[PDB]
Amino acid sequence: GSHSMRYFYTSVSRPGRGEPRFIAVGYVDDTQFVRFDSDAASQRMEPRAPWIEQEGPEYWDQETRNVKAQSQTDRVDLGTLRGYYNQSEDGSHTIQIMYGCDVGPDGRFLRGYRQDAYDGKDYIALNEDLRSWTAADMAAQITKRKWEAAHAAEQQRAYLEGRCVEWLRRYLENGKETLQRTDPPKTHMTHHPISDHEATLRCWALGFYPAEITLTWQRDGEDQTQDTELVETRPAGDGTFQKWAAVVVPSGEEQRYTCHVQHEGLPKPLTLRW
Amino acid sequence: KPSLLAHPGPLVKSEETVILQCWSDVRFEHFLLHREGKYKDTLHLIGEHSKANFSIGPMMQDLAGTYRCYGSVTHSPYQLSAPSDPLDIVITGLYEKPSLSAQPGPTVLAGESVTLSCSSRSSYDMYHLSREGEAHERRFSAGPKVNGTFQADFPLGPATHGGTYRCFGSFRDSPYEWSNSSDPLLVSVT
């Protein structure tokens, strides 16, 4: 299927308590592979997957340098946005930046994007044609004209269609053993009485990768949307994902209920039945 | 009233360093450098004999702005002198350079008038024309969009001697943050 590369930046102003907190991370699909933390000790961009450790010192020097430049830009942009909105120097404020690209299974560019936020709200975003920006408000309109004048759009677009795609594909090849792994869920079911007219039936999905998964309960072949509790998919800590789905049923109509599990690592969708 | 000037000059390229020297014929024991605007700050320095040398760190847009230098003697009471002439320190190189052109042409007979015009596709609110041997720039607002360009004229009057001129654009809400230099233009008097 598709693959993606994504970078995430966060800068948080810490009035009085030194200069802002900067954190940058990079993902290929649902796997983290690099990070930078301004509070960390090394002051280097650091590896977080084994397949990227094969890059040499010149790589780590460039990545370190560029991210630190990014942190400075973010630092000063905190000052600029504080002025735009006439905010006091006493409060903490936050800039978030997400960008990256997707390739299809044929390895062709499918899209790219860049969006920025201030204090948790859309600030400015790159339109889907990659040639212009959408500003959320008057302050961001000032940023828009600066960015048109700085040719920011052209440089993001060049990046998104060029090295983003090239490096994503490089990485997928270097790390194909893990990144291209089909890792299907181990499944099992649990069953607990709640009273003497009802019981809970919980369908479990563990150890799966990637995180995209669908868990549905049926009853006599009809969906049970309203009465089903399900949790947000969650990391297991080891690079894998978990999710469950539960339904309260009358005793003992258990046989009428069916859990359906769809995941790309499964040859075909499972049906589980107690 | 102290003297306050920039070395090598008040137009500082991104990431470079500049020295704001404070100078006075009468001895002062103390120097204060105040930046005004949105990033207000005061640097303190003692000096020598009498003068002081304030170093303004790798240039970024939060270091741009108007500086004034004071003097006093001594600490309590802070008998603050008159403020020096303002000194605007500007960061350049942040956006696409505008075009610069001469009318009737960049070469002219002595006493004929000359008009330099700054142009860009980008929506600058104002232009800044600097001449090689002068410390201040002439400035002037951009017109409205005409044939997709934003433009300002600097009529210079009758020509005496040459000039190498350069032109910079900027935006209203950040008047000390200027685009790249236009290609330098040489004005000759035949």
């Binding site: 970078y7 940058a24 990079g26 460039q62 990545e63 560029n66 991210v67 430049a69 990014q70 830009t73 000063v76 942009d77 600029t80 946005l81 960008y99 920025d116 600030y123 400015i124 961001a140 940023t143 600066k146 960015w147 700085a150 920011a152 440089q155 993001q156 990046y159 090295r163 983003c164 490096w167 | 847009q61 942040l94 943050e177």
Partner: peptide
């Protein structure tokens, strides 16, 4: 690889 291009807001 992250982006090298960046611009004040």
């Amino acid at each position: 690889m992250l982006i090298y291009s960046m611009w004040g807001k």
